[PDB]
């Protein structure tokens, strides 16, 4: 029931990422000379979070006060000195409440496998690509897939001649 | 009843992982020269979790205060010294409540078995593949299956000539 809807959601996301990669990889490598497939680890767990933050007021310069009683006594007779300080302070503090409801269906970790073809010249020899072109393909695929390191995304692009 | 629905859910997930692997393994190895099967250990246990986190306030620099009473007395007569400090502090602390309902049907551990064929040239000799090509197939399968180490995923790709 709901599981099938989630699976179809994942399939559509993967297909659209695949198409976005293919769109940029087509003009330079050529139609059919590139194949990519995407798998997506998604987030279907309902989470609700409330965050409370208090600004520190331990420093007297940023401390906000409402009432303060400072009783000071010094009975000098060091000799028979007698110092007494009774201090009472009531503070008002900065407060920030944030309520967050995470979206259901977010992407947790995306791994993408891309395979490119060789280059057959007018003679027909399948000449492999170069390192610079491979790096360009890797960068383009990283851009298309929305590659990020916090998610833990992995990308692998290899070059090999396609079968007949 | 519900068990059959869960089993069909597992079968669909396994079939889609299998198809995703086959899709990338087809262009280079060739149609029929690759077979893969997927088994999935799934999560059909309803879990509900509430998490509460308090930011530490043991350091006076990050401690937020509402009221503070500091009575200090020093009756010097070390001699007949008499020091007395009565300190009362009321704090306000950061608080974060997170409520999480894990999705039913998540994947716990995925193990995938892939078998590839040999290479029969124009003569017909079944020449086995190379180490580099095997490593490429392993990487592609890891990308397609969404291989992860936290889950405990295992992958095995072997090369052997297919039977008639």
């Amino acid at each position: 029931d709901l599981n099938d809807a989630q699976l179809k959601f994942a399939n559509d996301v993967e297909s659209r990422i695949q198409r976005r990669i293919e769109a940029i990889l087509s003009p330079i490598v050529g139609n059919g000379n590139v194949h990519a497939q995407v798998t997506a680890q998604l987030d279907f767990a309902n989470k609700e979070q409330t965050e409370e933050h208090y600004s520190p007021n331990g420093d007297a310069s940023k401390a906000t006060l409402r009432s303060r009683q400072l009783n000071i006594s010094e009975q000098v007779g060091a000799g028979p000195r007698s110092t007494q300080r009774n201090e009472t302070s009531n503070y008002e503090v900065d407060r920030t409440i944030r309520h967050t409801k995470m979206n259901v269906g977010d992407i947790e970790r995306l791994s993408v496998a891309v395979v490119v073809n060789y280059k057959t010249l007018a003679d027909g020899k399948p000449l492999p690509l170069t390192a610079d072109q491979m790096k360009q393909i890797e960068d383009l695929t990283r851009e298309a897939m929305g590659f990020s390191d916090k998610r833990g995304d992995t990308l692998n692009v290899v070059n090999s001649p396609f079968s007949a | 009843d519900l068990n059959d629905a869960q089993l069909k859910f597992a079968n669909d997930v396994e079939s889609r992982i299998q198809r995703r692997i086959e899709a990338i393994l087809s262009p280079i190895v060739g149609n029929g020269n690759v077979h893969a099967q997927v088994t999935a250990q799934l999560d059909f246990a309803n879990k509900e979790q509430t998490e509460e986190h308090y930011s530490p306030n043991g350091d006076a620099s990050k401690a937020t205060l509402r009221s503070r009473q500091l009575n200090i007395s020093e009756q010097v007569g070390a001699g007949p010294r008499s020091t007395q400090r009565n300190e009362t502090s009321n704090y306000e602390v950061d608080r974060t409540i997170r409520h999480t309902k894990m999705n039913v049907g998540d994947i716990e551990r995925l193990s995938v078995a892939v078998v590839v064929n040999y290479k029969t040239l124009a003569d017909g000799k079944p020449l086995p593949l190379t180490a580099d090509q095997m490593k490429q197939i392993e990487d592609l399968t890891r990308e397609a299956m969404g291989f992860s180490d936290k889950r405990g995923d295992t992958l095995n790709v072997v090369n052997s000539p297919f039977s008639a």
Binding site: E48, T50, R95, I97, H99 | T50, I97, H99
Partner: peptide, 19 residues
């Protein structure tokens, strides 16, 4: 409570409106 913090932010919005 999570709902308790929701109520706190609601009372803060109430103070905002009153001002």
């Amino acid at each position: 409570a999570i709902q308790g913090i929701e109520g706190v932010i609601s009372q803060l919005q109430a103070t905002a409106m009153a001002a």
